[PDB]
Amino acid sequence: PFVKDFKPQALGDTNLFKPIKIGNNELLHRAVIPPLTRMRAQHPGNIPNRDWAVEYYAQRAQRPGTLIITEGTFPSPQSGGYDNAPGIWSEEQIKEWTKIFKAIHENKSFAWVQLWVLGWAAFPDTLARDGLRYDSASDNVYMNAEQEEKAKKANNPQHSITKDEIKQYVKEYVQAAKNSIAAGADGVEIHSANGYLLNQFLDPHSNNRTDEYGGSIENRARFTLEVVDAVVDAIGPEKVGLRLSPYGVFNSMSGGAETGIVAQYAYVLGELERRAKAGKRLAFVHLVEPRVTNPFLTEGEGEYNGGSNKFAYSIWKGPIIRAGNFALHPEVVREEVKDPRTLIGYGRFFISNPDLVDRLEKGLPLNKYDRDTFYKMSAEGYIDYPTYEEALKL
Numbered sequence: 001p002f003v004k005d006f007k008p009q010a011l012g013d014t015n016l017f018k019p020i021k022i023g024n025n026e027l028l029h030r031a032v033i034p035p036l037t038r039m040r041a042q043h044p045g046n047i048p049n050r051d052w053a054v055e056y057y058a059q060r061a062q063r064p065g066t067l068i069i070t071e072g073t074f075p076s077p078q079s080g081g082y083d084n085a086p087g088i089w090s091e092e093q094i095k096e097w098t099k100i101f102k103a104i105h106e107n108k109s110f111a112w113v114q115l116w117v118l119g120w121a122a123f124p125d126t127l128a129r130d131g132l133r134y135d136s137a138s139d140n141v142y143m144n145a146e147q148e149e150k151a152k153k154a155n156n157p158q159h160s161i162t163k164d165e166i167k168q169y170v171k172e173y174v175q176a177a178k179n180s181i182a183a184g185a186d187g188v189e190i191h192s193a194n195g196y197l198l199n200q201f202l203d204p205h206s207n208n209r210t211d212e213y214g215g216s217i218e219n220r221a222r223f224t225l226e227v228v229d230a231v232v233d234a235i236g237p238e239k240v241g242l243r244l245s246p247y248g249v250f251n252s253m254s255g256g257a258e259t260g261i262v263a264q265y266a267y268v269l270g271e272l273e274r275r276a277k278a279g280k281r282l283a284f285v286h287l288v289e290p291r292v293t294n295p296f297l298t299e300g301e302g303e304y305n306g307g308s309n310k311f312a313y314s315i316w317k318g319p320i321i322r323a324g325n326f327a328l329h330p331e332v333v334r335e336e337v338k339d340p341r342t343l344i345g346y347g348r349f350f351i352s353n354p355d356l357v358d359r360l361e362k363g364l365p366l367n368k369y370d371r372d373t374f375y376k377m378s379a380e381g382y383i384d385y386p387t388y389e390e391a392l393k394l
């Protein structure tokens with residue numbers, strides 16, 4: 001069964017199906033799979049699912065030329081905090097990861113690892129169980145009143161990380177980037193969006209710092225640019241993306257509600273453009289649209305109208321991935337792709353449609369998706385989503 005109230009439309013006649021080089025990869029269509037954390041990683045070890053993970057990603061690589069960004073992946077153990085979320089720091093993990101990149105590559109597609117550091121969105125009790133800190137920008141301010149109790153009821157109060165501990169995360173970023181390139185990944189995406197650790201330093205709500213890492217637009221952005229500079233001078237600018245979520249409010253970010261939130265993101269896009277004109281242009285920049293400011297709200301909701309991502313394009317001149325609510329709105333995508341460096345990110349509806357790239361070229365209906373198997377240790381809601389040929393045949 002498909003989304004019953006979805007009147008689809010063909011996009012095969014749009015720039016969404018005209019090839020484009022991103023970094024080193026010759027994309028053949030500009031539908032990009034964003035990072036979607038599926039919570040099928042195995043505990044202990046944060047090991048990618050040795051039952052299902054290669055089938056999952058392979059399935060979704062089926063359309064040749066698909067830029068795929070992998071799920072949020074922990075650069076180290078201090079970085080995560082979720083039992084079932086893949087890491088990429090251990091030989092255990094890297095062995096399975098290389099199996100995944102090989103399955104993607106066999107399908108003539110590409111794969112980029114999203115380097116994910118949780119910050120305050122981690123479970124303080126899961127981090128206290130493994131003798132790790134609970135890191136944010138500040139120690140006064142908490143993500144919400146429940147995290148605050150979890151942390152306080154596990155003697156793991158929130159920790160403002162020092163200038164050293166930041167250096168260590170930068171280190172861990174570069175290594176996790178390097179692992180990812182050697183193990184086979186076509187590039188990495190520095191997760192600096194959705195309120196996780198980097199976003200928490202960007203957003204002036206979560207960042208109460210008094211040092212060179214807070215108080216000002218430049219300071220707040222210092223960390224995110226710092227990880228970008230390390231990972232770039234390590235593996236190379238053409239292998240390095242960056243994800244921003246300017247208007248989002250997930251994990252307790254200001255979004256549009258902040259007046260100067262747009263100057264904050266303009267500043268970082270300005271500093272990525274300054275580096276670009278100095279020889280070191282990133283492979284792409286990945287924007288969350290304000291269409292989706294909380295991915296766990298159904299579509300249409302939590303959508304901030306009073307703000308647009310267009311300001312990016314006047315600053316950053318390289319490719320721009322845009323993700324959010326684009327599945328159910330081909331008329332929006334048909335316009336947005338007229339710009340010749342725009343790529344569209346398809347999130348939730350790539351979960352349900354492994355052949356989502358066909359259904360977009362051919363205007364075919366989209367599989368309805370199951371919210372309850374998003375985060376579930378099961379193969380159902382993971383790889384048992386039919387292609388169009390298979391769904392009719394049901």
Ligand SMILES: Cc1cc2nc3c(=O)[nH]c(=O)nc-3n(C[C@H](O)[C@H](O)[C@H](O)COP(=O)(O)O)c2cc1C
Nearest residue numbers: 034035036037072292295323324325346347348374
């Ligand atoms: C189940 C789920 C897991 C997600 N995991 C991540 C993630 O790990 N990292 C990230 O940057 N975004 C993550 N996202 C957000 C998506 O990348 C995307 O921005 C969001 O789903 C909106 O796109 P859409 O309207 O096409 O679904 C996730 C979204 C969902 C629904």
